[PDB]
């Protein structure tokens, strides 16, 4: 949870391969 934003950035990376 405290690093959920890191996962969201990972999703953005998955959206920006």
- Both tokens of 6, joined, read 């890191």
DSSP state of 1: -
Rounded CA separation 10/17 (Å): 10
User: Tokens at residue 14, please?
Assistant: 């998955």
- Tokens linked to 8: 């969201």
């Amino acid at each position: 949870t405290r690093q959920a934003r890191r996962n969201r950035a990972r999703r953005w990376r998955a959206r920006q391969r």
